[PDB]
Write a protein that binds this ligand. Structure first.
Ligand SMILES: O=S(=O)(O)O[C@H]1[C@H](O)[C@H](O)[C@@H](O)[C@H](O)[C@H]1CO
Ligand SMILES: [Ca+2]
Length: 763
């Protein structure tokens, strides 16, 4: 490997061999159907709200999130990089697709890129491949990325990727090299109900100011989710020549293209705008160059996708964010690609600038850096919706991130309490917009009834003064029809209204305690939320009562009476609202929430403190279980700088107990914090959720330990999550971190919002 020296891959990059076969991957542990797309995954390409494309470590473009809210895992075989090499003085060269697999169609191409001949690396938003093959004398690498940039709401939105190639000749002979990008005209891949290829056509643009690009579109001007353009292209650099082929048939053997490329690495330069009928078609862009001994060359390619309209299953059509910058008519893929090819070096430097403070901190282990950056994949990958107007129709751009794909709910608030740390820390204007969306819902009432999945009772959809569980589903009407989730009735949940208040005050504190206007916007809703939750205190101890039914985020784990979890969240939310009332000079609110806080705090301690930890609750059969998340309210109080809600000594005892038990008694501390443990050191079997590790709960718990000076415990607690997710000894969950796993390592709900809580460790 001579090429690693010519490029700059950080040591914290997650690595795997191209074509590596991972043994003992995990699978779902539920009885009902659940997504399992295998361990062949990679860092995604694409901006927020753009739709994303997962290119795997094997090289294939395979995990398609272009239909916003949907996950479609299928390798589109035509979409590849390929290489040709010929040593000067040899009769023939060699050509090879850079994909460790094979299709079917395209039989003429050279498939099956060999094992032990290159590596994949990822430190999101960058990823790299290196090609170090005994039969390719010139070594190659590519750095691929999208311009995902904190505090930037422009380039971060773009439907674009850059592929910056480096080629180096370590031999003492001249070598002719070509690199070719092929792409299928994928108009019609989704959204089009009939005639899926009909009207697709490809054009070639030559911009000599030099860029050569293919634009793959359709003759129709219909404004529908399926219509728009893909583009691939390359920028000329000194010493390379460009060739292209506008149209090859993807539903054929591929030899129309491959007989050209495999001869001398130079395409026919044949333009052909003829639309197709039933055949699939594609385009190819190639560079050819001669490398002398010891020579390096760098050449950038790009990919864009102008698919301006997203459609949701309830019928609404919206423009995607990036259309603010490029237009809405679906004929702008070249403009996007050109912007990338002319600015990518600037984008690289912007990414480096944001990653450097963390990477350069030599007190932090590399594994922690691997996880911290790579868990950010989900902000783009999570079905992200970011609108720039309804089709046919404002100041703001509404946003939503999915819980996951299995449970297709936007912005699920009980989960975003954990998962939204990156947004407040790195994209705070998005965060505050999401919270205003919630503020706007609090007094919505919908008295129509739904059947509750868990018990088949009927319940009201949305109750005035209750915060909604979620802002809809991609199968229905995001932002318009809220509370799509129906397994339980969230109108009686005991965590949502407290978590809402906590999120609001968090968002003020972590953006510098300056945004009084945000506090003013949300203040009515904060007071309403707490006032409604107080009505659920049926025994007058000052604390809302859990009802012996899963009425909080652990939506199968029953809490009854006063719980540590909901009780502590309530205490913290009261303390937050007192502080907001001080800031806004609302005396009656300050006085009232202070009174409620002092009574609730005294009763919480009396009811739950056992001398070692806080009991799970007051009335359940396993009320003395040790819950990993028992002090969630004090965790957030630390972040919000609200001081001690509970005594320091008791918090420290509780954290030490959770480490000793839920971590170190659970598979020797190598898999995270199990949710519930009995005081005899045995995992609590009262519900499945008690026997699960929740990845995002565990990362949050690690930040709480860290703030409380339990440094070793904090990083040991988090390390098990990192190991399970990314290490050779784990279960193969990279770029699909799940909600949960059990002792056996098998999972529930891959591609999950909650583990974004790792960013709470950077507060
Ligand atoms: O019922 S589930 O879909 O599995 O629940 C999950 C989703 C819910 O929207 C969320 O509130 C809940 O915390 C999750 C627990 O893993
Ligand atoms: Ca009570």
């Amino acid at each position: 490997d001579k090429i690693s020296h010519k490029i700059d891959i950080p040591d914290s990059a997650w690595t795997i061999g191209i074509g590596e076969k991972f043994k003992n991957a995990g699978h779902p542990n539920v009885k009902y159907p659940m997504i399992d797309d295998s361990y062949v995954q990679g860092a995604p390409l694409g901006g927020f709200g753009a739709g994303t494309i997962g290119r795997t470590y094997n090289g294939g473009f395979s995990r398609w999130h272009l239909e916003i809210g949907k996950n479609k895992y299928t390798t589109v075989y035509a979409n590849q990089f390929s290489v040709f090499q010929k040593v000067e003085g040899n009769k023939d060269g060699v050509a090879q697709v850079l994909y460790a697999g094979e299709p079917g169609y395209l039989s003429s191409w050279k498939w099956d890129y060999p094992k032990e001949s290159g590596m994949y690396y990822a430190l999101y938003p960058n990823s790299w491949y290196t090609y170090t093959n005994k039969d390719l004398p010139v070594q190659l690498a590519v750095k691929q990325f999208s311009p995902i940039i904190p505090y930037n709401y422009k380039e971060t939105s773009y439907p674009v990727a850059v592929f910056k190639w480096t080629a180096y000749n370590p031999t003492n002979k001249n070598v002719d090299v070509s690199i070719m990008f092929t792409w299928q005209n994928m108009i019609g891949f989704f959204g089009k109900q009939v005639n899926v290829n009909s009207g697709n056509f490809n054009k070639i643009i030559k911009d000599k100011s030099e860029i050569v690009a293919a634009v793959m579109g359709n003759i129709s001007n219909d404004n529908e989710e399926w219509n728009g353009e893909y583009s691939i292209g390359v920028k000329k650099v000194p010493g390379v020549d460009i060739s292209y082929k506008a149209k090859f048939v993807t539903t054929g053997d591929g030899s129309d293209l491959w007989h050209e490329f495999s001869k001398n690495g130079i395409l026919d330069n044949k333009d052909d705008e003829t639309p197709t009928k039933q055949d699939g078609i594609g385009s190819a862009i190639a560079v050819n160059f001669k490398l002398q001994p010891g020579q390096t060359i760098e050449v950038p390619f790009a990919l864009s996708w102008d698919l301006p309209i997203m459609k949701f299953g309830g019928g609404d059509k919206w423009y995607k964010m990036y259309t603010k910058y490029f237009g809405k008519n679906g004929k702008n893929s070249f403009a996007i690609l050109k912007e990338a090819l002319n600015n990518y070096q600037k984008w690289e430097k912007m990414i480096d600038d944001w990653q450097k403070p963390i990477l350069s901190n030599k007190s932090k282990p590399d594994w922690y850096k691997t996880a911290l950056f790579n868990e950010l994949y989900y902000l783009a990958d999570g079905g992200t919706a970011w609108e720039n107007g309804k089709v046919g129709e404002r100041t703001n751009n509404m946003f939503g991130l999915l819980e996951c794909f299995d449970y297709n709910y936007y912005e699920t608030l009980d989960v975003r309490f954990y998962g939204s740390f990156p947004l407040v820390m790195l994209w705070p204007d998005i965060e505050k917009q999401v919270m205003r969306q919630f503020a706007d819902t609090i007094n919505v009432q919908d008295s129509s009834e739904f059947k509750v999945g868990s018990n088949g009772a009927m319940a009201v959809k949305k109750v005035q003064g209750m915060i909604p569980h979620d802002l809809g589903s991609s199968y229905a009407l995001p932002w318009i029809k809220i509370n799509a989730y129906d397994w339980q009735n969230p109108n009686i949940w005991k965590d949502l209204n407290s978590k809402y208040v906590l999120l609001v005050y968090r968002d003020y504190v972590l953006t510098g305690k300056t945004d009084k206007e945000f506090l003013k916007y949300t203040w009515k809703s904060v007071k309403t939320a707490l006032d409604k939750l107080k009505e659920m205190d049926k025994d007058n101890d000052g604390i809302p009562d859990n009802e012996g039914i899963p009425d909080q985020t652990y939506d199968t784990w029953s809490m009854k009476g006063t719980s540590a979890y909901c009780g502590s969240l309530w205490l913290a939310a009261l303390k937050a609202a007192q502080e907001i009332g001080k800031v806004l000079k609302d005396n009656e609110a300050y006085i009232k929430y202070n009174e409620w806080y002092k009574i609730a705090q005294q009763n919480f301690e009396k009811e739950l403190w056992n001398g070692e930890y806080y009991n799970f609750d007051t009335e359940s059969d396993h009320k003395d279980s040790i819950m990993a998340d028992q002090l969630a309210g004090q965790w957030y109080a630390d972040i919000l700088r609200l001081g001690d809600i509970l005594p320091k000594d008791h918090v420290q005892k509780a954290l030490k107990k959770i480490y000793e038990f839920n971590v170190m008694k659970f598979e020797n501390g190598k898999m995270g914090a199990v949710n519930g443990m009995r005081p005899d050191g045995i995992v609590d079997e009262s519900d499945i959720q008690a026997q699960e590790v929740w990845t995002g709960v565990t990362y949050a718990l690690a930040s709480f330990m860290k703030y409380r000076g339990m440094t070793e415990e904090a990083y040991n607690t988090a390390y098990g999550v990192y190991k399970m997710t990314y290490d050779k000894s784990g279960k193969g969950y990279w770029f699909r971190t799940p909600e949960a796993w059990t002792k056996d390592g098998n999972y529930r709900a891959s591609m999950y919002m909650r583990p974004l809580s790792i960013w709470s460790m950077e507060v």
